[PDB]
Amino acid sequence: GYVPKTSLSSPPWPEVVLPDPVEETRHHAEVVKKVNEMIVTGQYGRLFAVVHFASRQWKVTSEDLILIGNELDLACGERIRLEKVLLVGADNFTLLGKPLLGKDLVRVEATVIEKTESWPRIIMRFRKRKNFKKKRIVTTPQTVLRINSIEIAPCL
């Protein structure tokens, strides 16, 4: 069953030996204990959440803005807890869920600032030699959110 070391004897990639799950689950317990100490003692600075707000993933810190292409049917000024946060990072650690994080772990708040419409947005169709020329002008509603805080909790 031996093959002598030729060019095509072995596969060209170097083999990795993945660690055994006893020392690896123990190692993960050490790491989650470290990161949970950083969340307990407040070592982190500012956070950024990836939030699956609406239909798309917005990468978000605190104190910023998101322009969303639908009317949320809330009053301007109302606070909102964004569920479906799915990544939370700080400077020295992150947390990512499968696929979402626990609601007891991360709390992302956001107020509604303004409920505008878009700029008028032209929808023109034209086929040549056919006298086919249609024109429509569309403004979608929009709301702007101001992400107030990404507060994190020691629940690991």
């Binding site: 990795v16 030996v17 993945l18 660690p19 190692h27 993960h28 317990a29 790491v31 989650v32 470290k34 990161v35 020295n92 650690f93 992150t94 947390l95 990512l96 869920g97 499968k98 994080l101 626990g102 772990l105 690991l156």
Partner: protein, 82 residues
């Protein structure tokens, strides 16, 4: 002794799952440049366009000017961000 990437240059990446297996905790503090890895601080239109081309390693064509129709279409108060 396994490392999924050579945790040497950007940050020391230490992955973890939690006990429930639902969240992946990554722990990655920064790798400082060592003091050993450092050096101490040491203590006419034709030929002008060739000289600028050879100085900034670009071609000659962006040093020739452009007409007023292109100079005045330009937005002189562009929107700023961040």
């Amino acid at each position: 002794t396994y490392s999924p990437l050579p945790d040497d240059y950007n940050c020391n990446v230490e992955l973890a799952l939690t006990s429930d297996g639902r969240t992946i905790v990554c722990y990655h503090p920064s790798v400082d440049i060592p003091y050993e890895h450092t050096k101490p601080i040491p203590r006419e239109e034709g030929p002008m366009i060739e000289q600028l081309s050879k100085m900034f390693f670009t071609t000659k064509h962006r040093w020739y000017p452009h007409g007023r129709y292109h100079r005045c279409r330009k937005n002189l108060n562009p929107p700023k961000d961040r």
